[PDB]
Amino acid sequence: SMEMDEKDFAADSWSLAVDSSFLQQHKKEVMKQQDVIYELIQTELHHVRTLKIMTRLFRTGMLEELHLEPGVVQGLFPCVDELSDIHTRFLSQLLERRRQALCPGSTRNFVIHRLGDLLISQFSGPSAEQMCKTYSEFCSRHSKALKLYKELYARDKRFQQFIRKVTRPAVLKRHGVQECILLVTQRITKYPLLISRILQHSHGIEEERQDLTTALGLVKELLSNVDEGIYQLEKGARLQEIYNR
């Protein structure tokens, strides 16, 4: 993550991120809504950061330092550029909504009143079709990526040294290859609980409550569609095993 965004999201909550004199100006219900929106954006920033570790540190490092067989790096990190494109764009939109809302003269004091529309746009039309297509492909390749990783770590000396070298720093503690893959698979099923809790504290403006109710339904539809399009690919699985599924 870039320093500007890391510092903007360093606090444990929105109530601790904003100045105390600004916090005092809002009703309890607004602070509750704002803390949950802040958690959605902060976790999105961390998810984008996980995708940058996978593309820049892992994938690109293996291409530039290792002599693996063709199709191996792609097998390890399926759809990583498409996932990074979907979420970097979604993160840009969330950060721009926060930026426009800042008080003049402040880089930390803001209130986001209109998240629903942004969430409807992300989880509908072409962007939803691309999310559905990408996660259906990624989650169906999850087991194959893990098995390919385990095999390479156990049998390839230079691959093992590469992994131990780039995952040694403490800031990578939670972000080994397999941990990154599961963090990404689990991301999409975090959206309904974040959105429902934001909706819980967004009854003040009827149009906002309606837009978040629509967004929640679109997210659940996306998850149901992705879940229905999954079948784990297996390296070595014969056609007979597949058509007798």
Binding site: E39, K190, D227
Partner: protein, 179 residues
């Protein structure tokens, strides 16, 4: 320090997300209780053995049967959670969660955890449950369910007061270290 993987399973009302948060912070959040848990690698020393225990939540995956099993590969210990203020969470253990975990995690130890033990003697909980001809889960009911499902052990904790939380994760580490 050897690396082990822990996954917590159970109904959403079992308080699994809260349990992982309170353990990983060694504090019940005073300002904001997070809606979600990403992952965490806890440094634990149990009986003189140092372990890095990776923690994972399954909250949000309950209605997605093809997404949910993706959390299970290479799991070393399962925490099967239910809430003491909810007899309905305990009923979903033997024929929903238990057969799933035994299929995707064969021979992996399971610790059955009774969460929210601080609500067993809560007057508001007792009055609310009596409306559905129910009452808080009794300690023997938890032990009998753990015995029946072939659990490694039975434990209770409170994420609210922190009582028993550390013990659950130190025991999960011992179970993950076993042959």
């Amino acid at each position: 320090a050897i690396r082990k993987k822990l996954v917590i399973v159970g109904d959403g009302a079992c308080g699994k997300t809260c349990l992982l948060i309170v353990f990983s912070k060694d504090q019940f959040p005073e300002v904001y209780v997070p809606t979600v848990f990403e992952n965490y690698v806890a440094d634990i020393e149990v009986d003189g053995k140092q372990v890095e225990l990776a923690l994972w939540d399954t909250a949000g995956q309950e209605d997605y049967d093809r997404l949910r099993p993706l959390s299970y590969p290479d799991t070393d210990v399962i925490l099967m959670c239910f809430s003491i203020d909810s007899p309905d969470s305990l009923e979903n253990i033997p024929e929903k969660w238990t057969p799933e975990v035994k299929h995707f995690c064969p021979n992996v130890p399971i610790i059955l955890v009774g969460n929210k033990k601080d609500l067993r003697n809560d007057e508001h909980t007792r009055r609310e449950l009596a409306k559905m001809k129910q009452e808080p889960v009794k300690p023997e009911e938890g032990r009998d369910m753990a015995n029946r499902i072939g659990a490694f052990g039975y434990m209770e904790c409170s994420a609210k007061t922190k009582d028993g939380v550390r013990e659950v994760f130190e025991m999960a580490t011992r179970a993950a270290l076993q042959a």
